[PDB]
Protein backbone atom coordinates (compact mmCIF):
# COMPACT_ATOMS: atom_id res chain seq x y z
CA UNK A 1 0.00 0.00 0.00
CA UNK A 2 1.33 3.42 -1.03
CA UNK A 3 0.06 4.85 2.27
CA UNK A 4 2.74 2.97 4.20
CA UNK A 5 5.43 4.06 1.74
CA UNK A 6 4.57 7.74 2.14
CA UNK A 7 7.14 9.62 4.23
CA UNK A 8 8.07 13.22 5.03
CA UNK A 9 11.36 14.65 3.75
CA UNK A 10 12.75 17.87 5.23
CA UNK A 11 15.82 19.83 4.09
CA UNK A 12 16.30 23.17 5.80
CA UNK A 13 13.02 25.07 5.73
CA UNK A 14 11.46 23.07 2.89
CA UNK A 15 9.33 19.99 3.58
CA UNK A 16 7.41 17.68 1.24
CA UNK A 17 6.29 14.07 0.80
CA UNK A 18 8.57 11.26 -0.29
CA UNK A 19 8.07 7.75 -1.64
CA UNK A 20 9.81 5.08 0.46
CA UNK A 21 10.61 1.94 -1.57
CA UNK A 22 13.16 -0.49 -0.06
CA UNK A 23 16.04 1.69 1.25
CA UNK A 24 15.43 4.50 -1.28
CA UNK A 25 13.26 7.57 -0.66
CA UNK A 26 12.12 9.34 -3.84
CA UNK A 27 11.07 12.98 -3.71
CA UNK A 28 11.21 16.17 -5.79
CA UNK A 29 14.76 17.47 -6.01
CA UNK A 30 13.63 21.03 -5.18
CA UNK A 31 13.36 20.15 -1.48
CA UNK A 32 16.95 21.44 -1.29
CA UNK A 33 15.77 24.88 -2.46
CA UNK A 34 14.25 27.84 -0.65
CA UNK A 35 12.08 30.55 -2.19
CA UNK A 36 15.20 32.49 -3.16
CA UNK A 37 16.75 29.43 -4.82
CA UNK A 38 13.61 28.44 -6.77
CA UNK A 39 13.93 31.54 -9.01
CA UNK A 40 16.47 29.86 -11.28
CA UNK A 41 18.37 27.22 -9.32
CA UNK A 42 21.88 25.78 -9.61
CA UNK A 43 20.86 22.26 -8.62
CA UNK A 44 24.41 20.91 -8.97
CA UNK A 45 25.86 23.45 -6.53
CA UNK A 46 22.86 23.37 -4.18
CA UNK A 47 23.20 19.61 -3.99
CA UNK A 48 26.92 20.04 -3.31
CA UNK A 49 25.83 21.88 -0.15
CA UNK A 50 23.55 19.14 1.01
CA UNK A 51 25.12 16.08 2.57
CA UNK A 52 23.41 12.89 3.71
CA UNK A 53 22.88 14.37 7.19
CA UNK A 54 21.12 17.51 5.91
CA UNK A 55 18.18 15.49 4.57
CA UNK A 56 15.70 14.36 7.23
CA UNK A 57 13.30 11.48 6.54
CA UNK A 58 10.34 10.80 8.85
CA UNK A 59 8.41 7.55 8.43
CA UNK A 60 15.45 7.67 9.47
CA UNK A 61 19.08 8.23 8.45
CA UNK A 62 20.07 8.85 4.83
CA UNK A 63 23.22 6.99 3.72
CA UNK A 64 23.40 8.50 0.21
CA UNK A 65 21.82 11.00 -2.19
CA UNK A 66 21.59 10.58 -5.97
CA UNK A 67 19.83 12.98 -8.35
CA UNK A 68 18.10 11.50 -11.42
CA UNK A 69 16.75 14.26 -13.64
CA UNK A 70 14.31 16.11 -11.34
CA UNK A 71 13.89 13.48 -8.59
CA UNK A 72 16.21 13.06 -5.62
CA UNK A 73 16.86 9.43 -4.62
CA UNK A 74 17.87 9.17 -0.95
CA UNK A 75 19.39 5.89 0.26
CA UNK A 76 18.25 5.28 3.84
CA UNK A 77 19.62 2.91 6.48
CA UNK A 78 16.31 1.14 7.25
CA UNK A 79 14.60 -0.70 4.40
CA UNK A 80 10.83 -0.29 4.14
CA UNK A 81 9.07 -3.47 5.34
CA UNK A 82 5.71 -3.24 3.48
CA UNK A 83 7.20 -2.27 0.08
CA UNK A 84 4.90 -3.41 -2.75
CA UNK A 85 6.21 -5.03 -5.88
CA UNK A 86 6.55 -1.98 -8.10
CA UNK A 87 7.65 -0.74 -11.51
CA UNK A 88 8.18 2.72 -12.99
CA UNK A 89 6.14 3.55 -16.09
CA UNK A 90 5.37 6.66 -18.14
CA UNK A 91 1.74 7.42 -19.04
CA UNK A 92 0.22 9.73 -21.65
CA UNK A 93 -2.44 12.44 -21.22
CA UNK A 94 -6.01 11.22 -20.96
CA UNK A 95 -5.08 7.97 -19.18
CA UNK A 96 -6.59 7.56 -15.73
CA UNK A 97 -4.44 7.00 -12.65
CA UNK A 98 -4.90 7.30 -8.89
CA UNK A 99 -3.07 9.94 -6.84
CA UNK A 100 -2.69 9.70 -3.05
CA UNK A 101 -2.66 13.25 -1.68
CA UNK A 102 -0.44 13.81 1.38
CA UNK A 103 0.17 16.95 3.43
CA UNK A 104 3.12 17.12 5.85
CA UNK A 105 3.81 13.43 5.27
CA UNK A 106 0.37 12.11 6.27
CA UNK A 107 -2.06 10.87 3.60
CA UNK A 108 -5.43 12.54 3.06
CA UNK A 109 -7.34 10.77 0.27
CA UNK A 110 -7.15 8.83 -2.98
CA UNK A 111 -8.23 10.75 -6.09
CA UNK A 112 -8.68 9.47 -9.64
CA UNK A 113 -6.80 11.72 -12.06
CA UNK A 114 -6.09 12.18 -15.76
CA UNK A 115 -3.56 14.61 -17.22
CA UNK A 116 -4.99 17.24 -19.52
CA UNK A 117 -3.54 17.81 -23.01
CA UNK A 118 -1.22 20.46 -21.55
CA UNK A 119 0.14 17.69 -19.26
CA UNK A 120 -1.29 19.29 -16.10
CA UNK A 121 -3.64 18.00 -13.41
CA UNK A 122 -6.45 20.39 -12.49
CA UNK A 123 -7.41 19.77 -8.89
CA UNK A 124 -7.59 21.62 -5.58
CA UNK A 125 -6.60 18.62 -3.42
CA UNK A 126 -2.91 18.78 -4.37
CA UNK A 127 -2.66 22.48 -3.48
CA UNK A 128 -0.64 23.33 -0.41
CA UNK A 129 1.20 20.01 -0.83
CA UNK A 130 4.09 18.67 -2.88
CA UNK A 131 5.48 15.21 -3.56
CA UNK A 132 2.32 13.10 -3.81
CA UNK A 133 2.60 10.17 -6.20
CA UNK A 134 0.29 8.59 -8.77
CA UNK A 135 -0.07 4.90 -9.55
CA UNK A 136 -2.08 2.17 -11.27
CA UNK A 137 -2.82 -0.99 -9.27
CA UNK A 138 -3.15 -4.50 -10.69
CA UNK A 139 2.10 -4.89 -9.17
CA UNK A 140 1.95 -1.17 -8.37
CA UNK A 141 2.89 0.81 -11.50
CA UNK A 142 4.06 4.20 -10.24
CA UNK A 143 3.52 6.75 -12.99
CA UNK A 144 3.59 10.24 -11.46
CA UNK A 145 5.09 12.52 -8.84
CA UNK A 146 3.68 15.95 -7.99
CA UNK A 147 6.31 18.71 -8.18
CA UNK A 148 4.89 22.15 -8.99
CA UNK A 149 1.78 24.05 -7.98
CA UNK A 150 0.61 26.67 -10.47
CA UNK A 151 -1.75 29.55 -9.59
CA UNK A 152 -5.24 28.28 -10.46
CA UNK A 153 -5.06 24.78 -9.04
CA UNK A 154 -2.93 23.55 -11.96
CA UNK A 155 -0.27 20.98 -11.10
CA UNK A 156 2.84 19.82 -12.95
CA UNK A 157 4.72 16.63 -12.26
CA UNK A 158 7.23 14.04 -13.42
CA UNK A 159 7.41 10.29 -13.75
CA UNK A 160 9.38 8.32 -11.19
CA UNK A 161 12.50 8.65 -13.35
CA UNK A 162 12.33 12.41 -12.77
CA UNK A 163 11.31 13.51 -16.27
CA UNK A 164 8.57 16.14 -16.29
CA UNK A 165 5.34 15.54 -18.14
CA UNK A 166 5.07 18.44 -20.58
CA UNK A 167 7.31 21.50 -20.99
CA UNK A 168 7.63 22.23 -17.27
CA UNK A 169 10.67 22.85 -15.08
CA UNK A 170 11.12 22.90 -11.30
CA UNK A 171 11.53 26.68 -11.23
CA UNK A 172 9.16 29.28 -9.79
CA UNK A 173 8.97 32.83 -8.50
CA UNK A 174 8.10 33.67 -4.90
CA UNK A 175 5.06 35.67 -6.08
CA UNK A 176 2.31 33.87 -7.98
CA UNK A 177 1.04 35.14 -11.32
CA UNK A 178 -1.68 37.76 -11.15
CA UNK A 179 -0.71 38.92 -7.65
CA UNK A 180 0.34 42.34 -8.99
CA UNK A 181 1.97 43.33 -5.70
CA UNK A 182 3.32 46.89 -5.45
CA UNK A 183 7.08 47.16 -4.89
CA UNK A 184 7.26 48.91 -1.54
CA UNK A 185 10.96 49.78 -1.51
CA UNK A 186 10.53 51.44 -4.92
CA UNK A 187 7.60 53.55 -3.68
CA UNK A 188 9.69 54.61 -0.69
CA UNK A 189 12.63 55.55 -2.92
CA UNK A 190 10.28 57.61 -5.11
CA UNK A 191 8.90 59.38 -2.01
CA UNK A 192 12.45 60.30 -0.97
CA UNK A 193 12.96 61.65 -4.49
CA UNK A 194 9.85 63.80 -4.01
CA UNK A 195 11.23 65.31 -0.79
CA UNK A 196 14.56 66.08 -2.47
CA UNK A 197 12.51 67.70 -5.26
CA UNK A 198 10.69 69.84 -2.66
CA UNK A 199 7.44 67.87 -2.18
CA UNK A 200 6.86 67.69 1.58
CA UNK A 201 3.07 67.74 1.94
CA UNK A 202 2.81 63.99 2.63
CA UNK A 203 5.37 63.88 5.46
CA UNK A 204 3.57 63.47 8.79
CA UNK A 205 4.58 63.58 12.46
CA UNK A 206 4.55 59.80 12.90
CA UNK A 207 6.92 56.86 12.89
CA UNK A 208 6.11 53.16 12.68
CA UNK A 209 7.59 49.66 13.01
CA UNK A 210 8.23 46.97 10.43
CA UNK A 211 5.45 44.85 11.97
CA UNK A 212 2.86 47.63 12.03
CA UNK A 213 3.77 48.73 8.51
CA UNK A 214 3.67 45.18 7.14
CA UNK A 215 0.11 44.72 8.42
CA UNK A 216 -0.92 47.65 6.22
CA UNK A 217 1.28 46.48 3.34
CA UNK A 218 -0.35 43.04 3.23
CA UNK A 219 -3.77 44.72 3.41
CA UNK A 220 -3.06 46.90 0.36
CA UNK A 221 -1.07 44.28 -1.64
CA UNK A 222 2.36 45.82 -1.05
CA UNK A 223 5.59 43.88 -0.61
CA UNK A 224 6.30 43.55 3.13
CA UNK A 225 9.36 45.50 4.21
CA UNK A 226 12.53 43.89 5.57
CA UNK A 227 15.60 45.31 7.27
CA UNK A 228 17.42 44.70 3.97
CA UNK A 229 15.00 47.11 2.28
CA UNK A 230 15.64 49.57 5.12
CA UNK A 231 19.41 49.39 4.55
CA UNK A 232 18.95 49.81 0.79
CA UNK A 233 17.25 53.18 1.39
CA UNK A 234 20.15 54.21 3.67
CA UNK A 235 21.66 56.79 1.31
CA UNK A 236 18.29 58.50 0.81
CA UNK A 237 17.54 58.59 4.54
CA UNK A 238 20.96 60.13 5.20
CA UNK A 239 20.53 62.66 2.38
CA UNK A 240 17.11 63.85 3.58
CA UNK A 241 17.53 63.28 7.31
CA UNK A 242 14.28 61.28 7.24
CA UNK A 243 14.47 57.81 8.77
CA UNK A 244 13.10 54.96 6.67
CA UNK A 245 10.54 54.06 9.34
CA UNK A 246 9.40 57.69 9.39
CA UNK A 247 8.87 57.60 5.62
CA UNK A 248 7.05 54.28 6.09
CA UNK A 249 4.61 56.06 8.39
CA UNK A 250 3.96 58.66 5.69
CA UNK A 251 3.34 55.86 3.18
CA UNK A 252 1.01 54.07 5.61
CA UNK A 253 -1.11 57.22 5.84
CA UNK A 254 -1.04 57.56 2.04
CA UNK A 255 -2.25 53.96 1.69
CA UNK A 256 -5.05 54.27 4.27
CA UNK A 257 -6.18 57.77 3.22
CA UNK A 258 -5.19 58.11 -0.44
CA UNK A 259 -3.76 61.29 -1.91
CA UNK A 260 -6.96 63.33 -1.32
CA UNK A 261 -6.68 65.06 -4.69
CA UNK A 262 -3.00 65.96 -4.37
CA UNK A 263 -0.13 64.70 -6.51
CA UNK A 264 3.42 63.61 -5.74
CA UNK A 265 6.13 64.35 -8.32
CA UNK A 266 3.30 65.23 -10.70
CA UNK A 267 1.51 61.87 -10.34
CA UNK A 268 -1.85 61.06 -8.73
CA UNK A 269 -0.69 57.45 -8.20
CA UNK A 270 2.02 56.02 -5.98
CA UNK A 271 4.79 55.00 -8.39
CA UNK A 272 6.87 51.83 -7.93
CA UNK A 273 8.89 51.60 -11.17
CA UNK A 274 11.85 53.68 -9.93
CA UNK A 275 14.39 51.46 -8.15
CA UNK A 276 16.50 52.76 -5.25
CA UNK A 277 19.47 52.56 -7.62
CA UNK A 278 17.73 54.90 -10.07
CA UNK A 279 16.85 57.33 -7.28
CA UNK A 280 20.13 57.20 -5.33
CA UNK A 281 22.22 57.95 -8.43
CA UNK A 282 19.95 60.78 -9.55
CA UNK A 283 19.69 62.30 -6.07
CA UNK A 284 23.47 62.15 -5.51
CA UNK A 285 24.13 65.04 -7.94
CA UNK A 286 21.67 67.25 -6.12
Amino acid at each position, epitope marked *: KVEGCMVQVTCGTTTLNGLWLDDVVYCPRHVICTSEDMLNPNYEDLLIRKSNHNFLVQALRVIGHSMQNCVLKLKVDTANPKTPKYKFVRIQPGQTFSVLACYNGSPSGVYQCAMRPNFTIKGSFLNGSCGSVGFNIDCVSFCYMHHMELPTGVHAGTDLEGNFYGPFVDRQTAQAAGTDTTITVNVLA*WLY*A*AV*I*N*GDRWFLNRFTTTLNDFNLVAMKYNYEPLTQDHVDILGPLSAQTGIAVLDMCASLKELLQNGMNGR*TI*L*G*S*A*LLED*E*F*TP*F*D*VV*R*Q*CS*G*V
Partner: nanobody
Amino acid sequence: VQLQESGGGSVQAGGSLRLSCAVSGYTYSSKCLGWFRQAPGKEREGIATIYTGGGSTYYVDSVKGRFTISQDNAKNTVALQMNSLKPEDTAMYYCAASGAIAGIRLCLPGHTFYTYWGQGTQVTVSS
Protein backbone atom coordinates in the same frame (compact mmCIF):
# COMPACT_ATOMS: atom_id res chain seq x y z
CA VAL B 1 24.97 73.18 -23.23
CA GLN B 2 21.99 74.60 -25.17
CA LEU B 3 18.38 73.46 -25.63
CA GLN B 4 15.71 74.91 -27.94
CA GLU B 5 12.10 73.70 -28.19
CA SER B 6 9.78 73.76 -31.20
CA GLY B 7 6.26 72.94 -32.28
CA GLY B 8 3.93 74.67 -29.81
CA GLY B 9 0.78 76.55 -30.69
CA SER B 10 -2.99 76.61 -30.39
CA VAL B 11 -5.28 73.60 -30.87
CA GLN B 12 -8.89 72.61 -30.20
CA ALA B 13 -9.83 70.07 -27.54
CA GLY B 14 -9.24 66.62 -29.01
CA GLY B 15 -6.49 67.87 -31.32
CA SER B 16 -2.83 66.95 -31.59
CA LEU B 17 0.53 68.68 -31.32
CA ARG B 18 4.14 67.54 -31.65
CA LEU B 19 6.89 69.19 -29.63
CA SER B 20 10.56 68.89 -30.54
CA CYS B 21 13.65 70.00 -28.67
CA ALA B 22 17.13 70.42 -30.18
CA VAL B 23 19.70 69.09 -27.72
CA SER B 24 22.91 70.93 -28.63
CA GLY B 25 26.42 71.20 -27.24
CA TYR B 26 26.15 67.91 -25.35
CA THR B 27 28.82 65.26 -24.80
CA TYR B 28 26.65 62.59 -26.51
CA SER B 29 26.74 60.38 -23.40
CA SER B 30 23.92 58.78 -21.43
CA LYS B 31 21.58 61.47 -20.11
CA CYS B 32 18.09 62.10 -18.76
CA LEU B 33 15.81 64.12 -21.06
CA GLY B 34 12.44 65.34 -19.85
CA TRP B 35 9.41 67.28 -21.01
CA PHE B 36 8.09 69.70 -18.38
CA ARG B 37 5.04 71.93 -18.31
CA GLN B 38 3.94 74.85 -16.18
CA ALA B 39 0.61 76.63 -15.94
CA PRO B 40 0.32 80.23 -14.70
CA GLY B 41 0.84 80.31 -10.95
CA LYS B 42 1.17 76.54 -10.87
CA GLU B 43 4.57 74.99 -10.29
CA ARG B 44 6.62 73.46 -13.08
CA GLU B 45 6.10 69.70 -13.37
CA GLY B 46 7.78 66.95 -15.36
CA ILE B 47 5.32 64.85 -17.34
CA ALA B 48 7.45 62.59 -19.58
CA THR B 49 11.07 61.44 -19.30
CA ILE B 50 13.39 59.24 -21.36
CA TYR B 51 16.81 57.75 -20.60
CA THR B 52 19.04 57.88 -23.67
CA GLY B 53 20.80 54.71 -22.50
CA GLY B 54 18.17 52.00 -22.77
CA GLY B 55 15.36 54.28 -23.92
CA SER B 56 13.05 53.50 -21.00
CA THR B 57 10.26 56.07 -20.68
CA TYR B 58 8.16 57.34 -17.78
CA TYR B 59 4.90 59.29 -17.90
CA VAL B 60 2.85 60.90 -15.16
CA ASP B 61 -0.64 59.45 -14.78
CA SER B 62 -2.41 62.47 -16.33
CA VAL B 63 -0.59 62.44 -19.70
CA LYS B 64 0.56 58.81 -20.12
CA GLY B 65 -0.10 57.14 -23.49
CA ARG B 66 -1.72 60.31 -24.87
CA PHE B 67 1.75 61.84 -24.90
CA THR B 68 4.72 59.84 -26.17
CA ILE B 69 8.31 60.98 -25.61
CA SER B 70 10.98 60.10 -28.18
CA GLN B 71 14.70 60.52 -28.76
CA ASP B 72 16.76 60.92 -31.94
CA ASN B 73 20.46 60.96 -31.10
CA ALA B 74 21.21 60.99 -34.84
CA LYS B 75 19.42 64.33 -35.22
CA ASN B 76 19.92 65.24 -31.53
CA THR B 77 16.24 65.86 -30.84
CA VAL B 78 13.81 64.87 -28.10
CA ALA B 79 10.16 64.89 -29.11
CA LEU B 80 6.76 64.90 -27.43
CA GLN B 81 3.75 63.75 -29.46
CA MET B 82 0.63 65.08 -27.72
CA ASN B 83 -2.65 63.42 -28.73
CA SER B 84 -6.25 63.95 -27.54
CA LEU B 85 -5.31 67.25 -25.95
CA LYS B 86 -7.43 68.65 -23.11
CA PRO B 87 -7.88 72.26 -21.94
CA GLU B 88 -6.05 71.38 -18.73
CA ASP B 89 -3.03 70.60 -20.94
CA THR B 90 -2.72 74.35 -21.55
CA ALA B 91 0.71 75.39 -20.27
CA MET B 92 4.21 76.44 -21.22
CA TYR B 93 6.22 73.34 -22.16
CA TYR B 94 9.96 73.04 -21.49
CA CYS B 95 12.47 70.40 -22.54
CA ALA B 96 15.18 69.59 -20.02
CA ALA B 97 18.43 67.64 -19.81
CA SER B 98 20.36 66.11 -16.94
CA GLY B 99 24.10 65.83 -16.73
CA ALA B 100 25.72 62.65 -17.94
CA ILE B 101 24.53 59.66 -15.93
CA ALA B 102 25.15 55.97 -16.57
CA GLY B 103 23.96 52.74 -14.99
CA ILE B 104 20.37 53.84 -14.30
CA ARG B 105 17.19 52.90 -16.17
CA LEU B 106 14.35 55.35 -15.40
CA CYS B 107 14.58 59.14 -15.20
CA LEU B 108 12.70 60.92 -12.42
CA PRO B 109 10.28 63.70 -13.46
CA GLY B 110 11.38 66.29 -10.87
CA HIS B 111 12.89 69.56 -12.07
CA THR B 112 15.62 69.20 -9.42
CA PHE B 113 17.03 66.26 -11.41
CA TYR B 114 17.75 68.30 -14.56
CA THR B 115 20.42 70.89 -15.28
CA TYR B 116 19.84 72.43 -18.72
CA TRP B 117 16.54 73.93 -19.85
CA GLY B 118 15.01 75.24 -23.04
CA GLN B 119 13.20 78.55 -23.40
CA GLY B 120 9.70 77.06 -23.32
CA THR B 121 6.97 76.82 -25.95
CA GLN B 122 3.31 77.53 -25.24
CA VAL B 123 0.55 75.00 -25.83
CA THR B 124 -3.04 76.29 -25.77
CA VAL B 125 -5.98 73.85 -25.87
CA SER B 126 -9.31 75.64 -26.17
CA SER B 127 -12.88 74.55 -25.50
